[PDB]
Design a protein around this ligand. Structure first.
Ligand SMILES: NC(=O)C1=CN([C@@H]2O[C@H](COP(=O)(O)OP(=O)(O)OC[C@H]3O[C@@H](n4cnc5c(N)ncnc54)[C@H](O)[C@@H]3O)[C@@H](O)[C@H]2O)C=CC1
Ligand SMILES: NC(=O)C1=CN([C@@H]2O[C@H](COP(=O)(O)OP(=O)(O)OC[C@H]3O[C@@H](n4cnc5c(N)ncnc54)[C@H](O)[C@@H]3O)[C@@H](O)[C@H]2O)C=CC1
Ligand SMILES: O=CNCc1ccccc1
Ligand SMILES: O=CNCc1ccccc1
Ligand SMILES: [Zn+2]
Ligand SMILES: [Zn+2]
Ligand SMILES: [Zn+2]
Ligand SMILES: [Zn+2]
Lengths: 374, 374
């Protein structure tokens, strides 16, 4: 009944940095050619959404944030082939156009149509589908999921299993898949190895899950908040260390614990200092360190290239290195076969209208993921 | 007849940074247990030896430098099992002890017995085999080849083919193998890829050789000295670029030349700025950059970690990633079988006594490798 019409609905609009979201009425345009309009069912609160509020992650404002979600297709624009009305879907914050040099590369996933490197906060066509208070509102990573309805480009949505539980599999839209794939696909963690995971939020827990799945022998979780440790051990950490408990710098501690450095280390926080520390704690000749955390905008780190000349490998990735539209349906299929677990990441469920409470839970240290239900 | 006796011979001693080498009469002690005394036959002049003169590379002084060499075993100490008197040998500036965690790892080559990370300028036992007028002289990377005779630990020497031409295969001891392995083993250059090689000295030429052997379709050489370009093209460069010719940064030039970034880049100079340019010029989602050059002591580079978060891989290596004692004999066997050429790297041949002329040639930009003969 809403097909072809403007929808009036509620959305959490961010008008300014360092302010609460404003839940208010927005207008959602119908989809144009090759666009899909989605009724949201569930969306998670990712630290990257909070980085938009804090200015850590720059994107044009005002904006409808949110990018870790699941919903149901309300309507399709002309020419859409990959989803239909009524389909369950996960929006893809990293698109898969399938035509660019990256999408054609066997190892690349950072499609050239992304809105991450040089964010414009628009649809692919350079326009917005959202109006609020008579003003156009920006999109966020081609997703914008903090709204009862959103419109996405076809290359930014994946059809998933019709029986999927949307209030869990929304995590496959960002935090689970990012962590998991950072271990299994990007680092390529090996059986019997020693891993160190810096940051034990939802993404870092998912990195632990991937390390465990890969057969790591030792998985050392590192966090300054010791309340994170219990859950990290439940999902596979063999030891947890709090850097504040030690007189020596933590790279020194880890190098000792691992008899000369770890095989794989992961930065899952977003601090320049910890990126360098995590690189330093992997074994100097054959260690690999993966940056997963989002750094403060435009800031450089400083490091001694001798850390690399001895033989370390340093890399980063977006979305766990997964080709998004290929991988998300498969991940969902795997979750419904119970190949991995999502419940350990979900600490809190709230209705969408309590989004600001959800962000307070994250900021205070209390939650891993809060799922918002519409 | 000299076995078990002190040898008096000439060696080139570096007493002070930024001075010429001094040809001195030195005393070379006989080898102690698990040590090998070698009569030199040929030694190349590598930029890393110059780095000791310039203070780029810090190692205790006074010192006998030289590390890219071949010779003949004059005698062996008690318990030596891998070489005998009369054998042709290449000293190994990176050892292969066979027992440490790196030697046991399939990929690692930076054996924990190395004298690179925290240089002591001694034999493994913490002492020197060289004296000049009563004063102990330090060793260099457990090799010290700018001498008519040297003493090395058994873990720092490999036996090679009895028929091999020592005045050529000395380059397997450092520059050739470092460049070639950086391409074929560390980067794992693929068929049909685009490569960019920063620095077209002996090591960079060997990188080009390796890229061509791996089947690269495009190999872009980058040097500020356009006199290096002809030889780079002879050994497989498809194009050469001088950053001084352009009114914009070379990473932008290379990114446009490669239609969005190269597949593999190599820093083969030793400058922090070129390390960051080389990383930048490889494709943001799937590019790999390898640091080969030796940076100035204790200096840090500055870089934006978003270069890695997109998907780039940054690594470095010593000695092309080769496990030294296993690989050097095989590389010599491959040269004897015409699998690669060494003559394109040799521009000058001089008697040992003319070492300072050899260094003048390197510093002026005229030479690639000067081989010093005994
Ligand atoms: N590369 C990618 O595609 C993606 C990156 N991100 C990023 O990953 C990072 C983690 O995301 P979440 O798990 O959602 O965040 P989170 O905030 O829940 O977890 C981060 C953890 O780091 C810990 N921490 C903070 N400072 C620390 C320090 N100095 N040392 C050790 N631990 C410290 C916190 O106590 C917390 O448990 C964020 O920067 C986020 O923006 C998330 C998703 C996708
Ligand atoms: N990682 C390893 O195991 C090893 C590393 N090294 C290092 O590799 C580097 C290369 O050694 P060689 O080939 O013997 O040296 P080289 O001095 O013959 O060649 C370096 C080249 O860099 C070029 N160059 C200098 N400044 C430049 C700039 N700003 N931009 C572009 N080109 C520039 C020069 O014109 C020269 O042709 C040195 O730093 C050396 O210490 C060499 C052997 C082993
Ligand atoms: O959390 C999801 N996406 C945000 C993101 C921003 C920049 C880099 C990686 C990820
Ligand atoms: O040229 C060979 N070795 C010198 C060297 C010193 C430090 C790091 C790598 C190599
Ligand atoms: Zn694409
Ligand atoms: Zn996220
Ligand atoms: Zn070893
Ligand atoms: Zn060298």
């Amino acid at each position: 009944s809403t097909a072809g019409k403007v929808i009036k609905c509620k959305a959490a609009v961010l008008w300014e940095e360092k302010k609460p979201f404003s839940i208010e009425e927005v207008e959602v345009a119908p989809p144009k050619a090759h666009e899909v309009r989605i009724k949201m069912v569930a969306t998670g609160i990712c630290r990257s959404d909070d980085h938009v509020v804090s200015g850590t992650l720059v994107t044009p404002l005002p904006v409808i944030a949110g990018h870790e979600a699941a919903g149901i297709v309300e309507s399709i624009g002309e020419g859409v082939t990959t989803v239909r009305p009524g389909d369950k879907v996960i929006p893809l914050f990293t698109p898969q156009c399938g035509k660019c040099r990256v999408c054609k590369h066997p190892e690349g996933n950072f499609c050239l149509k992304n809105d991450l490197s040089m964010p414009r906060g628009t649809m692919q066509d350079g326009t917005s589908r959202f109006t609020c208070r008579g003003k156009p509102i920006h999109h966020f990573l081609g997703t914008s999921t903090f709204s009862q309805y959103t419109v996405v480009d076809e290359i930014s949505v994946a059809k998933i299993d019709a029986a999927s539980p949307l209030e869990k599999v929304c995590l496959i839209g960002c935090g689970f898949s990012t962590g998991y794939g950072s271990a299994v696909k990007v680092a390529k963690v090996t059986q019997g190895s020693t891993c160190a995971v810096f940051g034990l939020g939802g993404v870092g827990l998912s990195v632990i899950m991937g390390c465990k799945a890969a057969g790591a022998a030792r998985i050392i979780g590192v966090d300054i908040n010791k309340d994170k440790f219990a859950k990290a051990k439940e999902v596979g950490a063999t030891e947890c260390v709090n850097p504040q408990d030690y007189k020596k710098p933590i790279q020194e501690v880890l190098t000792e614990m691992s008899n000369g450095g770890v095989d794989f280390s992961f930065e899952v926080i977003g601090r320049l200092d910890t990126m360098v520390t995590a690189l330093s704690c992997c074994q100097e000749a054959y260690g690999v360190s993966v940056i997963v955390g989002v750094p403060p905008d435009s800031q450089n780190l400083s490091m001694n290239p001798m850390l690399l000349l001895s033989g370390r490998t340093w890399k980063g990735a977006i979305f766990g290195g997964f080709k998004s539209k290929d991988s998300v349906p498969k991940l969902v299929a795997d979750f419904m076969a119970k190949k991995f677990a999502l419940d350990p990441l979900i600490t809190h469920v709230l209705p969408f209208e309590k989004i600001n409470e959800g962000f307070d839970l994250l900021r205070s240290g209390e939650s891993i993921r809060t799922i918002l239900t519409f």
